[PDB]
Structure 1
Amino acid sequence: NFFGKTLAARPVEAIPGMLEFDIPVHGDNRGWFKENFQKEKMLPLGFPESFFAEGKLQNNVSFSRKNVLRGLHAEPWDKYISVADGGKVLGTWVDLREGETFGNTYQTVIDASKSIFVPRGVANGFQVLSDFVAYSYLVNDYWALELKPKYAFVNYADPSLDIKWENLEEAEVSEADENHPFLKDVKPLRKEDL
């Protein structure tokens, strides 16, 4: 369930606006290639035109080792998340938008054959499952002081979240991520904050 998939998108019903994509990966264990993002094909599958509305683009990459656990961060921009190497992560999302889906969750394994569109307001995180992973994402806005109040964070280890991690005991977590508020102390992101 890795090579040769048809390019396709599925909405995540618990988190409005999120999309999971199957990405065609061609080859085998020795090497492969993919079109990780293709704007002309992905728009008709539901990738939102609003992603492109301001003409802003940034691609970040992090290279991380097994058991690293980052999150859960709702940064004030949309994100398209992918894996660029042979690794894999347990992707994890918690909706922090005010409304009937506040606190809703989704989890899936992200590898080179699966990508995820995450709307602004949905907190993102991952735990690295493979020995290492190249985690490559696109965003549609740039850091600005005025955006600082528009972030929201929730603690990866709040046991009331409808998520589980692969290896909570051996997780390698930043000091900041250890100290994010539990869900009960998150101020839901209002329409004015998005």
Structure 2
Amino acid sequence: MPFEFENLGMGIILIKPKVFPDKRGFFLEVFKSEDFTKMRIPNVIQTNMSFSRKGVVRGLHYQRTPKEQGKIIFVPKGRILDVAVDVRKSSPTFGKYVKAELNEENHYMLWIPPGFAHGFQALEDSIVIYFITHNEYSPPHERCISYSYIDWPIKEVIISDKDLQCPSLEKAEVFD
């Protein structure tokens, strides 16, 4: 009506858009500025997309202040295990995480505020859309924590050489 929001912990929210099927296919509103603002999810200022073969893992990524990003993750085709880990030193849940299956069949989305490291595994070949808030892409602010922080369900992982080099949490430049 047209969105159910569910707090999953730590400021992360599962968003569940309403899907309207008819003879043509279906339609949904994915995000709207007023409704999201009512939930204190600010406006999207950039959107990216990836296509990822089954077993791919991307992450775990974040940009540091002053270019911190919020993210709404959505999966129009396929299915992922999506993850957000608290990477804020002084948080009482620093290092805790939430996993959320996002897929084409649920159309659910994950909102991940600034201060979290994001990644996922592709459980099937998947298109992921990333609606990004706060700040745009800025290379010298990119950081990451190692994929190995998480025990991914598909063992036949496909990870870039770059992400394979991400540091452990204890050695990463994280949030205050």
TM over 0.5: yes
- Residue from 29, 32, 41 that aligns with 2:35: 41
The equivalent of 2:132 in structure 1 is: 139
Secondary structure in 1 matching 2:52: strand
State TM-score, norm by structure 2. 0.84
Spell out, residue by residue over 1:8-61, the C-alpha distance to the aligned partner (whole angstroms, 9 max, x if none): 111122x2x221111212338x943221112222333x143xx23xxx711111
Q: Matched residues in 1 for 2:35 and 2:2: separation?
A: 12
Task: Select which of 26, 49, 71 maps to 2:59.
Answer: 71
For structure 1, the residue ranges without an aligned partner over 5 or more in a row are none
Deviation at 1:6, TM superposition (A): 6.3
Q: What is the Cα deviation at residue 186 of structure 1?
A: 2.2
Checking the alignment, whether the CA contact within 8 Å between 1:59 and 1:138 is kept in structure 2 is yes
**Whole-angstrom CA distance in 2 between matches of 1:69 and 1:142:** 22
Q: Measure, in 1, the Cα distance between the counterparts of 2:118 and 2:145.
A: 10
Amino acid paired to 2:128: Y
Please give the root-mean-square deviation of Cα atoms over the aligned residues, in Å.
Answer: 2.2
Alignment of 1:166-181 (within 5 A): 166-167=153-154, 169-181=155-167
Q: CA deviation at 1:119?
A: 0.9
Identity of aligned residues (%): 29
1:8 aligns to 2:17 (yes or no): no
Scaled by the length of structure 1, what TM-score is found? 0.77
- In the aligned structure 2, how far is the partner of 1:188 from the partner of 1:153? 9
Alpha-carbon distance in structure 2 between the residues aligned to 1:186 and 1:38? 35
- The runs of 5 or more residues in structure 2 that have no matched partner are none
Count of aligned pairs:
167
Contact 2:2–2:29 under 8 Å retained in 1: no
Structure 1 segments of 4+ aligned residues over 3 angstroms from their partners: none
Question: Counting strand residues as a fraction of each chain, which structure ranks higher?
Answer: 2
CA distance in 2, matches of 1:118, 1:175: 25
Aligned to 2:171: 185
How many angstroms apart in 1 are the aligned matches of 2:174 and 2:131?
A: 24
Q: Give 2:144's aligned residue.
A: 153
Partner Cα separation in structure 2 for residue 110 and residue 186 of structure 1:
27
